[PDB]
Structure 1
Amino acid sequence: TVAKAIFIKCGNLGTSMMMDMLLDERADREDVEFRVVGTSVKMDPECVEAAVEMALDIAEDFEPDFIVYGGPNPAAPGPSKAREMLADSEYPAVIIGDAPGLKVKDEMEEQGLGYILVKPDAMLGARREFLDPVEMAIYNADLMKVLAATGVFRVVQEAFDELIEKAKEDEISENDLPKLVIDRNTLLEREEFENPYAMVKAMAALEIAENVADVSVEGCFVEQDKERYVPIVASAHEMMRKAAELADEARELEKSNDAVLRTPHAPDGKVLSKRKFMEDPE
């Protein structure tokens, strides 16, 4: 049995960039089929409605088991429109967002929607005087390293792998949909790191990443004097570059102990596991 899902991407978040690929890392899974659609970085109501309409049009013939909408701020006008539309459909749906989505957690539960809110997936320093295409890619590279090496992406992988198993049995109820809020403390109960200083460095990285959002918000929405907001948004990006270095340090500590956790998918979808470098995943 093959699980099917549609992913909708409007605006950009580190987790939404990677969400679907974390589920079939080598494209050799025989038990899933996905469609991805979106309006690139635009996330205003008009564009989001168009993205969701594309998804629901495709859904008629594709018959997805679930639909995922990912992008910044579930509480903003565009994303709110996607929530209304998905909540109004027959398809089980999950919203992937950032910390600002906490504001509409109750609304989503009432809408029968699942959610994964990633607090360290911080908004970048989006002022024209600082953020050009290259800087936007450098920041996303640092954020991707943080979310991957700290183990945050493994939490997302697990949540979706569980939903995929239920999708195969056409047994996805509203109570099966995730209601997750990820942050620094999430790491305390993961079996991610064998070395404790790796866990602690990873936690420091996620704390710094979560803190970057407040700096970006101050420089993009509060401060209006350019002589002040340009340095402010740039400082947010310097923070994120150091958070990636902490995440890199944590991973190198696991390498020193030959204890790097790897959880690849088998062709039939089963999530395997290994720690030692030369050990086969099982």
Structure 2
Amino acid sequence: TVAKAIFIKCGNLGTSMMMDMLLDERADREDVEFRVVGTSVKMDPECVEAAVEMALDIAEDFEPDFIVYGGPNPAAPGPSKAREMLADSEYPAVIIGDAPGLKVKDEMEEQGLGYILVKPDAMLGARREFLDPVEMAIYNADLMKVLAATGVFRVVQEAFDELIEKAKEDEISENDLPKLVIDRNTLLEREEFENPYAMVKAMAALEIAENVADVSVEGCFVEQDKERYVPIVASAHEMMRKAAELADEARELEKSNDAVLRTPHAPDGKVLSKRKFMEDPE
């Protein structure tokens, strides 16, 4: 009873922003307790070491059943330092990352770490001439809408909820750690949408979101002429804004059919389900 976990956040990913809250949406679950720590947007090896140190430090008394590290590119220097420290700890760990994480997928399975790699969680257009705090927040709002309305966050919610159950049985083995890669095609194996065109619009939203990453990468790391890289990173943000609109359109189709899936948590932690607006969740 009452599973515990520590979430570590370094750098920012739409999924890492929301991961812990997706598990206790109304703060009324009594089978879980969480702690969240991090160094904000900084994700260099020095800053990531400090963050895992905090986590490992509080774990001593908190005693988490599992620890989660979430942020961009698990293949980078900083995140790699975190996988190192978590794999060689006494707590099972899961790494939440984006597409670049695929580079170290096998390496993570070798380290005995779990993972949830979200391909559509795309890097933003991080050039100083374009990305100020407001633009970053706008992009994150659009990405958050895409990940939520397409149902990607439900896949994540379900992974952590199943792990939370395995954890209560005090039996968390490596074979229990999730090993997920989420993308457009993930929706084909789900029953998220009652309307077929809502699922197809959600798929198109996820494909565009995944494609945003290549554009941001080109503008931030490849293109060196500012007359070209500023328009390039901005075009990636215009793409995400349309992906958010497709996701919104999909959700509205479910509303027209009074079939919006909702899977809220009960106080005991069980995931309920409902489709009709006035239907009690069971």
The TM-score, its normalising length taken from structure 2, stands at: 1.00
Q: CA deviation at 1:234?
A: 0.1
Q: CA deviation at 1:169?
A: 1.2
User: Is the partner of 2:8 in helix, strand or coil?
Assistant: strand
User: Take 1:22 and 1:221, find their aligned partners in 2: how far apart are those partners?
Assistant: 33
User: Take 1:188 and 1:25, find their aligned partners in 2: how far apart are those partners?
Assistant: 26
User: Take 1:191 and 1:49, find their aligned partners in 2: how far apart are those partners?
Assistant: 40
Q: CA deviation at 1:66?
A: 0.2
Question: Alpha-carbon deviations, 1:208-233, whole Å to 9, x = none?
Answer: 00000000000000000000000000
Map residues 182-193 of structure 1 onto 2, 5 A cutoff: 182-193=182-193
User: Take 1:152 and 1:36, find their aligned partners in 2: how far apart are those partners?
Assistant: 22
Q: CA deviation at 1:70?
A: 0.1
> How well do the aligned residues superpose, as a CA RMSD in angstroms?
0.2
Uncovered stretches (5+) of structure 1, i.e. residues with no partner? none
User: Is the partner of 2:260 in helix, strand or coil?
Assistant: coil
Q: CA deviation at 1:121?
A: 0.0
User: Take 1:77 and 1:207, find their aligned partners in 2: how far apart are those partners?
Assistant: 28
User: Take 1:176 and 1:167, find their aligned partners in 2: how far apart are those partners?
Assistant: 9
TM superposition outliers: structure 1 runs of 4+ over 3 Å: none
Q: Quote the residue 1:69 is aligned against.
A: 69
User: Take 2:189 and 2:52, find their aligned partners in 1: how far apart are those partners?
Assistant: 35
Question: Alpha-carbon deviations, 1:73-124, whole Å to 9, x = none?
Answer: 0000000000000001010000000000000001100000000000000000
User: Take 2:231 and 2:170, find their aligned partners in 1: how far apart are those partners?
Assistant: 52
User: Take 1:167 and 1:9, find their aligned partners in 2: how far apart are those partners?
Assistant: 22
The TM-score, its normalising length taken from structure 1, stands at: 1.00
Segment of structure 1 superposing worse, 165-174 or 42-51: 165-174
User: Take 1:253 and 1:171, find their aligned partners in 2: how far apart are those partners?
Assistant: 42
User: Take 2:195 and 2:270, find their aligned partners in 1: how far apart are those partners?
Assistant: 26
Map residues 240-259 of structure 1 onto 2, 5 A cutoff: 240-259=240-259
Question: Alpha-carbon deviations, 1:179-223, whole Å to 9, x = none?
Answer: 000000000011100000000000000000000000000000000
Q: Does 1:43 align with 2:43?
A: yes
Map residues 1-282 of structure 1 onto 2, 5 A cutoff: 1-282=1-282
User: Take 1:79 and 1:149, find their aligned partners in 2: how far apart are those partners?
Assistant: 28
User: Take 2:261 and 2:207, find their aligned partners in 1: how far apart are those partners?
Assistant: 22
Question: Alpha-carbon deviations, 1:107-166, whole Å to 9, x = none?
Answer: 100000000000000000000000000000000000000000000000000000000001
Q: CA deviation at 1:245?
A: 0.1
User: Take 1:60 and 1:277, find their aligned partners in 2: how far apart are those partners?
Assistant: 45
Q: CA deviation at 1:280?
A: 0.1
Uncovered stretches (5+) of structure 2, i.e. residues with no partner? none
